[PDB]
Ligand binder design. Structure first.
Ligand SMILES: CO[C@H]1O[C@H](CO)[C@@H](O)[C@H](O)[C@@H]1O
Ligand SMILES: CO[C@H]1O[C@H](CO)[C@@H](O)[C@H](O)[C@@H]1O
Lengths: 151, 151, 153, 153
């Protein structure tokens, strides 16, 4: 028997939330869907984030609550994610993730979401890429951290 | 800011494998699909396991390889998983998980798969239930461990 | 023979910021002593440099600055019960965002805060019915981040 | 202010079996000393009771049996380089499936195996280009399970 390995982690950032969640697919996590209530002209409220690498490897964090989704944004990442960032602010009594941006060596995706709050940055040791995420969530996305491994 | 929490883990059991994977959905992980090559009368070879809690929260471990799937088994868990077990044996040069069984307080599901190999048992501290899994995988399922939290 | 999966404790945190090295200390027996070392003075401003955690003479960890230091201020905490909460403040020092203040809370007594009362506050609480049995974080010249290992009482 | 996510090292293992308490020790500085304590005798059979890991006098952990023990056999290992691999054997002792043998390997030297050469073998290797900077596991009266924390050289 050869001992199995578990990827290093960066984070989480954010606050304690109802449930722990973790998603680290074998294949490149390359598609993210952000869902919000509200509207662009009257502030977008991040409710849930859906991460996937393909049709049968996907997770939805936050969005457990009844609040109807009004707006969705699909992001297709074509490269290796090396950092994510965003803002944290209160929403209906909880400190949640309100905006998020993803950064690869080539380009940047976002920020998506609200514009106010306290900033967070999840970076990883040089020579690595982000291959999964974990955090705390319930009706909203409370905390988030990333799994990383060598490029 | 209130520090986020991360669930305890039991395992992994098995051997090092190409890629680390992790799946801990917010909602009850209640459906498992086991896919095999071969056949019941000539030995079933576990190739991949698909875990899910609903249509948009699912992961497939193993099954990256070309080997065509010939047989699938769907298991619907209606309760709280407290333990899993199975056998580990060699398959085309790798020590992989060859059979698996899931045990709840009410009933047991399986074993499913081959019948030979060295046994493994993933149990958890009393008063807890399994809410996710993690492990190593590539073409096959190399290692597996579980995330647990209070019932 | 038989592989019977081993368990790892749940975690709360880390909070703070990325630091040089990752560190971890979860001893088998109860933590019962914490030594905080600072430059400066309480009459003025205390600069938290290192934290020494231990459960006994042969189970101890030192995180944060350990190199050369002249006359330093020390604070020794002797814990009696189960630590259930930790808090403090984070702020910048010599170019690094480090833990500047820290307070340890058990059901029996509250210890601290110790240090400089300025910066962003942090709080490490754990699920009811649990106890903190270890800590982990990042550290270099100072204490950059910290989190806690917990398990059921 | 700003939350800059802290990093935690990758892990290899644990191997062995479930034990009483989870334990963890990842010191900032290089491990450089390991003390193994056994009942029995090398001329006969050595029963591994505890492992003491340390990087210096103020960074040490003791896992496994610590209670009363008469005359015990000791083995002190002084590590020089980066530990890259650990191995040993697991077998039953007084009703528990514990670590019975262990060997530590660095690029410069191999230390062990130490203990009883019987039972199921285990091997903790890490991804090429990395080094072991800590260990974790389960322990009680004996050493039940062990795994390693690793990071890039
Ligand atoms: C509305 O309450 C729910 O959702 C929030 C936020 O996501 C969680 O913190 C909380 O524990 C519940 O799950
Ligand atoms: C066939 O090789 C691939 O699949 C095996 C098993 O699942 C992994 O161990 C290996 O690293 C590769 O990913």
């Amino acid at each position: 028997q050869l001992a199995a390995h578990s990827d290093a982690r960066s984070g989480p950032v954010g606050s304690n939330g109802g449930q722990f969640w973790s998603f680290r697919p074998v294949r490149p996590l390359n598609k993210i869907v952000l869902s919000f209530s509200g509207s662009p002209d009257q502030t977008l409220n991040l409710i849930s984030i859906t991460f996937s690498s393909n049709p049968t490897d996907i997770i939805t964090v936050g969005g457990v609550g009844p609040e109807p989704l009004t707006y969705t944004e699909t992001v297709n990442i074509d490269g290796d994610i090396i950092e994510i960032s965003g803002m944290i602010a209160n929403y209906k009594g909880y400190n949640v993730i309100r905006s998020i941006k993803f950064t690869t060596n080539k380009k940047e995706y976002g920020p998506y979401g609200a514009n106010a709050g306290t900033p967070f940055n999840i970076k990883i040791p040089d020579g690595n890429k982000i291959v999964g995420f974990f955090g705390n969530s319930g009706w909203y996305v409370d905390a988030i951290g990333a799994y990383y491994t060598a490029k």
